[PDB]
Design a protein around this ligand. Structure first.
Ligand SMILES: *[C@@H]1O[C@H](CO)[C@@H](O[C@@H]2O[C@H](CO)[C@@H](O[C@@H]3O[C@H](CO)[C@@H](O)[C@H](O)[C@@H]3O)[C@H](O)[C@H]2NC(C)=O)[C@H](O)[C@H]1NC(C)=O
Ligand SMILES: *[C@@H]1O[C@H](CO)[C@@H](O[C@@H]2O[C@H](CO)[C@@H](O[C@@H]3O[C@H](CO)[C@@H](O)[C@H](O)[C@@H]3O)[C@H](O)[C@H]2NC(C)=O)[C@H](O)[C@H]1NC(C)=O
Ligand SMILES: *[C@@H]1O[C@H](CO)[C@@H](O[C@@H]2O[C@H](CO)[C@@H](O[C@@H]3O[C@H](CO)[C@@H](O)[C@H](O)[C@@H]3O)[C@H](O)[C@H]2NC(C)=O)[C@H](O)[C@H]1NC(C)=O
Ligand SMILES: *[C@@H]1O[C@H](CO)[C@@H](O[C@@H]2O[C@H](CO)[C@@H](O)[C@H](O)[C@H]2NC(C)=O)[C@H](O)[C@H]1NC(C)=O
Ligand SMILES: *[C@@H]1O[C@H](CO)[C@@H](O[C@@H]2O[C@H](CO)[C@@H](O)[C@H](O)[C@H]2NC(C)=O)[C@H](O)[C@H]1NC(C)=O
Ligand SMILES: *[C@@H]1O[C@H](CO)[C@@H](O[C@@H]2O[C@H](CO)[C@@H](O)[C@H](O)[C@H]2NC(C)=O)[C@H](O)[C@H]1NC(C)=O
Ligand SMILES: *[C@@H]1O[C@H](CO)[C@@H](O)[C@H](O)[C@H]1NC(C)=O
Ligand SMILES: *[C@@H]1O[C@H](CO)[C@@H](O)[C@H](O)[C@H]1NC(C)=O
Ligand SMILES: *[C@@H]1O[C@H](CO)[C@@H](O)[C@H](O)[C@H]1NC(C)=O
Ligand SMILES: *[C@@H]1O[C@H](CO)[C@@H](O)[C@H](O)[C@H]1NC(C)=O
Ligand SMILES: *[C@@H]1O[C@H](CO)[C@@H](O)[C@H](O)[C@H]1NC(C)=O
Ligand SMILES: *[C@@H]1O[C@H](CO)[C@@H](O)[C@H](O)[C@H]1NC(C)=O
Lengths: 560, 560, 560
C-alpha cells in the first residue's frame, strides 16, 4: 500500500496565525495564595462564515516592444454577457494617466468570446479564462471567509473586502456599514446563476450581489442574515491549572497551554448576560468530565466554579482543588480554632500556606522553564521548515510560509498515488553539468483528468513549478520519498523502486545494533582529470554556512 | 587529559538508514478494548556477514591536450602478476567506441611494476597503488557486507554486487543464483594469498574467488557455507506498551518506540516453526525481567503471552497487564454475576471498560503528540547537522551525510591527541584578505606513522581536505575545540591553548549568575579607512538568510 | 500596553561562555553501589570585581590619495590637557618604520581642542571624541572586569590587560606581579577627576592609575585592596542526584544538571580549611531545605553529609538517601543476621543491592539519553539563533554571537516603546527593485534625547546599522513585531498597526480548530510581462538550501 500524495500551494495570507513566544518566568517563587484546580479556557467565538465568492476581472496587456494592469469588469457585462450569454466582452476599459482608456483583444474588434475552464484543474475554483493590446477576461469562483463583526470579509486571494457580505437593500440586512460608494455596489433581485461549462441555468432563483473594486469585481450569493450564535466558545479543557496571586492580579499557568493569563482578581459576573447558560452548562460539564477522570479519588472541590476575564479576550473558568493529604492540615487547624467547609477557609493559615506556596512555585517555574525550552525550539523549527511544523500543528498536511513574523496557512490537495508518474531520467539535456536535484513527476488531480507537469518535493510533496536544480555532480546516489516507499536514483537515472522495508530504520532514540562498516571513498577517476565536482549529498549546516563563504570570495574577485 | 580525535570520512552509501516520520494521532480516543502490558518487539534477523573483499582495477588516462575510464583487471593477471609476482601489468585493455583498445604506462612499453601501499594510511585497506596514455593499477582490500538472502552483497564502496559470496563449483555451495555470466566469474582451488608489502605468501591454503565487473574486479576468501542461525532476533524490550483495537486491527503504541504497529487481531501460530523455542524462551525471559522490575508489585498477568505479526516485518510478543486497583472492579463485577480468573474476562463489562478506554486513550494520544514533537524536531536536526545526530543515535562518533531522503553511515577513525599538531598561523599568504576560517592541523594515523595535512573541524573532527575558507576580516577572535580543551586564536594567529576550566560553562538550562557586562564595540580604525569588512563570528540564521539576499542583488547588477 | 524594545550591540568577547556537549551514556548499567540523595554543587568563587576603567587613545589617519593606526596618549597629556584642561593635544606621536613619527590635525598646527561627548548616546560610556594627517583624540569610560587571581583584568573592549587593577606603589597593594615595564605605568596620589561635559572637578580626592599599552592608554580609580571573601560559592541546589561507583571513581548524575562528575572515592577533608564553616553551614542548610520539601515523608537520611572534589574545580556535597520501601529490605536482612543504623550498612547485602543497582541504572541512563537529546538539539539551536537561546538562558534579553566554538555575551539596552518611530515607506528610492526587507525605525535612547537612525529587527530587536535588504518583489505581504503588537506592511508600505489580539494564535501544540481555507494564488499580471520575481516570504530551509544552488550555477556560467 502507498500513502496519498499532497500538492501544497503557496498560501496568499488569507489565514494568519501568530505563534506564542517565550514568557518571562520568575527566578524565585514570589507568588501568593497558590492553588491547583481544573480550568477550561474559552476563545471568543469568531463565527467563521464561508461562501464561494466569484471574482471577475480583466487583464489588459500590450505587445509593444507595456503599462499592464488589472481592471474590474462592469456589472452589466457580468449580468448580460457572462451570465445571460456565458461570454466576456472583448473590449475593456482601464485607467491610464488619470484618464479612461480602451483596450482590445489582440488588436482586434469587439467580438463575443466564451469563458473556458482553467487548465490548473485545482479545487479552489474553475478559474474560467478566455485566453490561455491583449485583453483577457478571467472568472474565478474562489472561496471567502468572514469574521464575527461581519463588516468586512477576506477572499481566498487575501485581499480584504471592506463590504459586509450581508449588505444590500432587498431587506433589512447589514446596511449600517459600507466603505465603498453606492455606485460601486449593486444587488440584483431574483437573479439566476449558471455554470459556464454547461450553461444549464440555475435550478432556483438566487439573488446575486456585485461589488466593483479598484482592481477587480466580486459577486456572491446574498443570504438575508445568518442567525445568532453563542458569543463564547470552548478552546481547551486543561487537565491541571495553577493560579498565582501577585501584584494585585492572578497568574494562571498550565503544562498544556504554554501561555500565562492575567486577571483582575474579581470574578466576572457571567450571569449578567443570557450567554451564561450556553457557557455555564458547557463549562460546568467540562469540570465533571475532567474531575471524574482522575481528580475524583485524590482531590476535593473547593466551592463552586469561578469565572475571570483574561488579557487578550480569553475567558477562563476555574475550579480550585486541593490534594487529600493537604486537607488533613486544613481540617486539623480548623479543629484547633474550634476548641470540611473548605470554602472561604483556603489561605487562612499562613504557616500551612507557606510551604505549599513554595512547593507549587517550583512546579509553575518548572513548567515555565520547560515550556520556554520547547517554545524557543519550536519557533526556530517553524522558521526552518514551516511546512513540517504546520502539518504537525493542524493535525493534517497543510502548507505554510513565513510572512515576516506571522505564519500563513493554506490547504493542500490530496491525490492518490495511482495518478502520479515519475520521470525515469531526471537529468536535463538543455544544459550539461546542471539538472534537477529531485525527480520530475507528472500527475492528474483526479482519475482520467488532464496531465500536468511538476516536481517531486520532500515528504511526498508535489510542486507545480520545476525549479529545484543544482550543479549535478558525478557519482550521485540519493533516495526520494515516493508514496509508501522510496525511489532509488543513481547517477541521475531511475534505477528501481524499493519498499519501506528495504531500508534499515532507526526508530528508537539510540540504536547501536546497526551493521555499519568502514566506508571507502570510491572517488571516480573522471573528477581527477576533468576537474569537475563530486557528489556530497544535501549540504550540512556547516557546509551551507561554508558554501556561502566561497561565494563571498567570488564577488570580491569579480569586484576587484 | 585530552579526548581522542576523530577523522570522519564521507560515507559512500554502503549502509542506508531511513529515520521514522511523524505519524497521524487521533484527535479523540476512538479505540476499543484498551489494555496495558509488557511488549518485546523483534526485528528480522538480517544475518550480517562481513568479509574483506579485495578489489582490483586499472585506471587509464591520457595526457593529450581524454576519454578516461576504469576497467577491470583479468583473472590471469591477478593470479600471475599480482599474486605470484606482486606486480601489475603495465598494459591494460579498455573499451572505446564499442571496440577493445590497449593502453600503456606513460607512453612506455610493457614492464613489471610493483604495487606500493597507499599514502592515506587508512584502516579501510592498504589500497596498494603503483603510481601516486597513463595506466595505473590499484588494489584495495576494502570491506564488504551481505544480508540474510546472501544472493547479493555490498562492498564498502557501495556498489552492489549481484553475485553471492558463497557462489562457486568447488562444493555444493550457493550455486542456485548468479546474474553474471560464467566467464565473468572464476574460482581457484588451493589458492594462496599474500601481502604485497612483505610478499611472504599465505601460511595455509586459502581458496580465492574472482569476479570481473564492467568497472572493476573483486576477489575474496571463499568460505564453503555459513551455518544456519535464528530467523528472528530481539530489537527492544519495551517497558510499557498499550494495545488498541480499531478498524478490525490492533494498534500498538509505546513511549520509547515512536512508531505504531498494526496487526490482524489473530495470534500468529509461532509454534508451527522450530524457531518458537529460540524466540519463545528469549521472549518469555524478557517478560519476567521487565515484569519483575516494576510490574511485580502493581500489576497482575492477564493469561499467557501472545504473539502477533506487524506491518513491515516486525514480530511483537505481548503480555496484557492490568493495574491492581483496576482488578478490584473486575472481581467486584465477577462476584455480582456469580450470585481471579482474569483470563477471558477482560472487556466483558462495557461500563467498567468505558472509562479505561478513554483514560488510556489520552495516554496514547499524549505519547503520539509528544512523539511527533520530537520526531518533527529530530528530523530537522538531522538535516541541519547529521554528524551530531548520527553520533548521538549510534552511541559513538560516526559520520553521516544526507543522501536525499535517506541517511548514510560510515565509521570514523579515532586518533590520540598526541599525534596531531596545529599550525600556529592559520592565515594563508597565497591570497590576502582571504584565509582558512578554522585552524590547520597535521597528524599521523598512528605513532611514528606518516604525516598528513588536514583541517580542524567542529567537535574535534578532522577533515582530510582543507577547504573551510572565508573572507578573513580584521579584529577576529574565535575559539576552536582541540582535544580536552580549546585553542584561542586572535587576528588569525595562534595565541595560546586554554583548558576547559578557563571558560565559563552554562550547564543548567537557566543560569543568571553570569558576570556579563556591557560590551563596547571597539571597531578598528582600519575598517573606516580601508573600507574592509569587520569580524562577526559565525553567521546567525537571520544573518545567513540575509547574506544570500545581498548575493541575489549582486547577480542582478551583473546581469543588468 | 506595549513591551519595551531592546537594542542588542555586537559582543566583543569580554565574557566567554562554553556550552555543555553530549556525554557518553552506558549502553547497559555497569555501575556499582547505586544510591540516591540530595546534592548541592558549588562553583569556584571567581570574585568578579568591576570598575569603570577609562580608556584614552589617539586615532591617526592620512588623507593622501594611508598607514593608519591607534597610538596611546602619554600620561602628562591626560593629567595636564584632558584632566586639568578638558582638551586633547592636536599633535600625536605614532611609530612608523620602527621610528617615532609626528602627526597633526587636518594638516594644522598644535592647538587645544576640547573633547565632545559621543553621538551614540549609549550606556557603555560617554565616549568623548573631538572629531566626529588627521589625528583624533577619543576618551571612553568603558567598563572592566577582573577575576579571582586579580593579576589580570579584561576591559569591555575584550582586550586583556596584563596589569593588576590594585597594582601601585602608594601602599602595600598587589605589587607582586606586573608584565609591563615600570615606565609603562604611573600612579598619581591625590589625583582629582572630572567630567569633560561639565568640568566641575571631583568632589573628593580620587587617586588615579595610568597604564600605556602598545595601542591605547587606560586609567581607573585605584582602590587600595578589596577585602577577602568565601573561596567557594553555591551553584545549584539539585533536587535529586544519583551516585555511581565504577572504575575506582564515583559518577554523579542528575536530571537538572546535564553533566556528569567524577571523584576519587575519598571524602575531601573540607574541615582542614577555615572556609568549612562558610560552606558547611551553607551546604547543610540546603540539605534541610530540599529534604524538608519532599524527601521528609518518603526518605531517610543515610548518615551525615559527604564532600567530594570533582573534575573541573566543582565541589559537591552529597547526602545519601534511600526510599522508605527500600528500608524494609535492609532492616529485614539486618534482623536476620542479628539472630535503623543505616550508616555503614548500605551495600552490605549484595542480593538486595543487585536489583537497585539495575533499577537506578535505567534512571541514570534515561536521564543521560534524554539529556543528550536536548543537548544535541540545544547546541544546534544556539548556532542557528544564538540571540534567542542567549535570552532564554540568562533570564533576560541578552546579545550573543558565535565566536567559533565559544559563546559571547553582552548586555542589551532597553528602551521604551514611546521613543521609537517606524518609517511609513520602507522602500528605498536609491535603487529600484531592491529595498530593505524589514521596516526602518528612528529612536532615542531616552526621553528628549538625540534621534538616531536604525532598522527594526526580529523579536523587537533594534539594529544600529540598516543593512537587511533583498530584491524587493511584487505583491509583498508581511508582518513585523512592534512593541506589544504587530505592524502590517503590504507592497512595502505601512498600512496600519494591529494589536496582538487581531491575529489568530496557536498556543497549544495541536490546534485543529483553525478556520483555514483553500488559498488561491493571485499572481499579479505584472510578473508575467515584466519577468520580475514574486514574493515568497522568508526562505524555507529547503528554499535557502536551494537558492544557493542557483547561485552555484551562476558562477559556473560566469567562469565559463
Ligand atoms: C481591570 O480593571 C480595570 C479598571 O476598571 C480595567 O481597565 C478599564 O477598562 C475599561 C473597559 O473595560 C475602560 O473603560 C473605557 O476606557 C476608555 C476611556 O478611558 C474608553 O474606551 C471608554 O469610554 C471606557 O471608559 C477603563 O478606562 C479602564 N480603566 C483603566 C484605569 O485603565 C481593566 O481592563 C481590567 N482588566 C481586565 C483584565 O479585565
Ligand atoms: C492479514 O490477513 C490478510 C488476509 O489473509 C493478509 O493479506 C494476505 O497476505 C497473503 C500473504 O501473507 C497473500 O497471499 C499471497 O498473495 C499474492 C496473490 O494475491 C501472492 O503473493 C501469493 O500467491 C499469495 O496468495 C494474500 O493475497 C493477502 N490477502 C489479501 C486479501 O490481501 C495480510 O497480510 C494480513 N496482515 C498481517 C499484518 O499479517
Ligand atoms: C585523585 O588522586 C590523584 C592522585 O593523588 C590526583 O592526582 C594528583 O594530583 C596532584 C595535585 O592535586 C598532583 O601533584 C602535583 O603534580 C605535579 C607533579 O606531578 C606538580 O603540579 C606538583 O609538584 C604536585 O606534585 C599529583 O601529581 C597527581 N598524581 C597523579 C598520579 O596524577 C587526582 O587529581 C585526584 N583526583 C581528584 C578528582 O581529586
Ligand atoms: C490570600 O487569600 C486570603 C483569604 O482571602 C486573603 O486574606 C484576606 O485579605 C482581605 C483583603 O484582601 C482581608 O480583608 C481579610 O481579612 C483577609 N483574610 C481573610 C480570612 O479573608 C489574602 O489577602 C490573600 N492574599 C493576597 C496577597 O491578597
Ligand atoms: C473486545 O473484546 C471482547 C471480548 O473478547 C469482544 O466481545 C466478544 O466479541 C465476539 C466477536 O468478536 C463475540 O462473539 C463475543 O460474544 C463477545 N463477548 C465475549 C465475552 O467474548 C469485543 O468484540 C471486543 N471489541 C471489539 C471492538 O471487537
Ligand atoms: C560498595 O560498598 C561496600 C561497602 O562499603 C564495599 O565493600 C567493602 O569493600 C572494602 C574494600 O573497598 C572491604 O574492605 C570491605 O570488607 C567491604 N565490605 C564492607 C561491609 O565494608 C564495596 O567494595 C563497594 N563496591 C565497590 C565496587 O567498591
Ligand atoms: C468519586 O469517588 C467516590 C468515592 O469512591 C464514588 O462514590 C463516586 O461515584 C466517584 N464519582 C465519579 C464521578 O466517579
Ligand atoms: C546487538 O543487539 C544485542 C541484543 O540483541 C546486543 O547484545 C549486542 O551488543 C548488539 N550489538 C552491538 C554491536 O552493539
Ligand atoms: C513479586 O511479589 C511477590 C509478593 O510480594 C513476591 O512474593 C515475589 O517474590 C515477587 N516476585 C519477584 C520476581 O520479585
Ligand atoms: C547569584 O547567585 C546567588 C545565589 O548563589 C543569587 O542569590 C543571586 O541572585 C545571583 N546573582 C544574580 C545577579 O542573579
Ligand atoms: C518530617 O516528618 C515528620 C513525621 O511526620 C514530622 O514530625 C517532621 O516535622 C517533618 N519535618 C519537616 C522538616 O517537615
Ligand atoms: C472545533 O472545536 C470543537 C470543540 O469546541 C470540535 O468539536 C470541532 O471538531 C473543532 N472543529 C474542527 C474542524 O476540528
Amino acid at each position: 500500500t502507498d500513502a496519498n500524495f499532497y500538492v501544497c500551494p503557496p498560501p496568499t495570507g488569507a489565514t494568519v496565525v501568530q505563534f506564542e513566544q517565550p514568557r518571562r518566568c520568575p527566578t524565585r517563587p514570589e507568588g501568593q495564595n497558590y492553588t491547583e484546580g481544573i480550568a477550561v479556557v474559552f476563545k471568543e467565538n469568531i463565527a467563521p462564515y464561508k461562501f464561494k465568492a466569484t471574482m471577475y476581472y480583466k487583464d489588459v496587456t500590450v505587445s509593444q516592444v507595456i503599462f499592464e494592469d488589472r481592471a474590474p469588469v462592469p456589472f452589466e457585462e457580468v449580468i448580460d454577457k457572462i451570465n445571460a450569454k456565458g461570454v466576456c466582452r472583448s473590449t475593456a476599459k482601464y485607467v491610464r494617466n488619470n484618464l479612461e482608456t480602451t483596450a482590445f483583444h489582440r488588436d482586434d474588434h469587439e467580438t463575443d468570446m466564451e469563458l473556458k475552464p482553467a487548465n490548473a484543474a485545482t479545487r479552489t475554483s474553475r478559474g474560467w479564462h478566455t485566453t490561455d493590446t491583449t485583453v483577457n477576461c478571467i472568472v474565478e469562483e474562489v472561496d471567502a471567509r468572514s469574521v464575527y463583526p461581519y463588516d468586512e470579509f477576506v477572499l481566498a486571494t487575501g485581499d480584504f473586502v471592506y463590504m459586509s457580505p450581508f449588505y444590500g437593500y432587498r431587506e433589512g440586512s447589514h446596511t449600517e456599514h459600507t466603505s465603498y460608494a453606492a455606485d460601486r455596489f449593486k444587488q440584483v433581485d431574483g437573479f439566476y446563476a449558471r455554470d459556464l461549462t454547461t450553461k444549464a441555468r440555475a435550478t432556483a432563483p438566487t439573488t446575486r450581489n456585485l461589488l466593483t473594486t479598484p482592481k477587480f469585481t466580486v459577486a456572491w450569493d446574498w443570504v438575508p442574515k445568518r442567525p445568532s450564535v453563542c458569543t463564547m466558545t470552548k478552546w481547551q479543557e486543561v487537565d491541571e491549572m495553577l493560579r498565582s496571586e501577585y501584584g494585585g492580579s492572578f497568574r494562571f499557568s498550565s503544562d498544556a497551554i504554554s501561555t500565562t493569563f492575567t486577571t483582575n482578581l474579581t470574578e466576572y459576573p457571567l450571569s449578567r448576560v443570557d450567554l451564561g447558560d450556553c457557557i455555564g452548562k458547557d463549562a460546568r460539564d467540562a469540570m465533571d468530565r475532567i474531575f471524574a477522570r482522575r481528580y475524583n479519588a485524590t482531590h476535593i472541590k473547593v466551592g463552586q466554579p469561578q469565572y475571570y476575564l483574561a488579557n487578550g479576550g480569553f475567558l477562563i473558568a476555574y475550579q480550585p482543588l486541593l490534594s487529600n493529604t493537604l486537607a488533613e492540615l486544613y481540617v486539623r487547624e480548623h479543629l484547633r480554632e474550634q476548641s470540611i467547609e473548605f470554602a472561604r477557609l483556603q489561605f487562612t493559615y499562613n504557616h500551612i500556606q507557606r510551604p505549599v506556596n513554595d512547593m507549587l512555585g517550583r512546579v509553575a517555574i518548572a513548567w515555565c522553564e520547560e515550556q520556554n525550552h520547547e517554545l524557543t525550539l519550536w519557533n526556530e523549527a517553524r522558521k526552518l521548515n514551516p511546512n513540517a511544523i504546520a502539518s504537525v500543528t493542524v493535525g493534517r498536511r497543510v502548507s505554510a510560509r513565513m510572512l515576516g513574523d506571522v505564519m500563513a496557512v493554506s490547504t493542500c490537495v490530496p491525490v492518490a498515488a495511482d495518478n502520479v508518474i515519475v520521470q525515469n531520467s531526471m537529468r536535463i539535456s538543455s544544459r550539461p553539468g546542471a539538472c534537477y536535484s529531485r525527480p520530475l513527476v507528472s500527475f492528474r488531480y483526479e482519475d482520467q483528468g488532464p496531465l500536468v507537469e511538476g516536481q517531486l518535493g520532500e515528504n511526498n510533496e508535489l510542486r507545480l513549478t520545476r525549479d529545484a536544480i543544482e550543479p549535478c555532480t558525478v557519482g550521485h546516489r540519493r533516495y526520494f520519498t515516493f508514496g509508501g516507499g522510496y525511489v532509488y536514483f543513481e547517477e541521475y537515472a531511475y534505477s528501481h523502486q524499493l519498499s519501506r522495508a528495504d531500508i534499515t530504520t532507526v526508530s528508537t532514540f539510540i540504536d547501536l545494533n546497526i551493521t555499519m562498516l568502514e566506508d571507502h571513498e570510491f572517488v571516480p577517476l573522471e573528477v581527477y582529470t576533468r576537474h569537475e565536482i563530486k557528489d556530497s549529498g544535501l549540504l550540512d549546516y556547516t557546509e551551507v554556512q561554508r558554501r556561502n563563504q566561497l561565494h563571498d570570495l567570488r564577488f570580491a574577485d569579480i569586484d576587484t
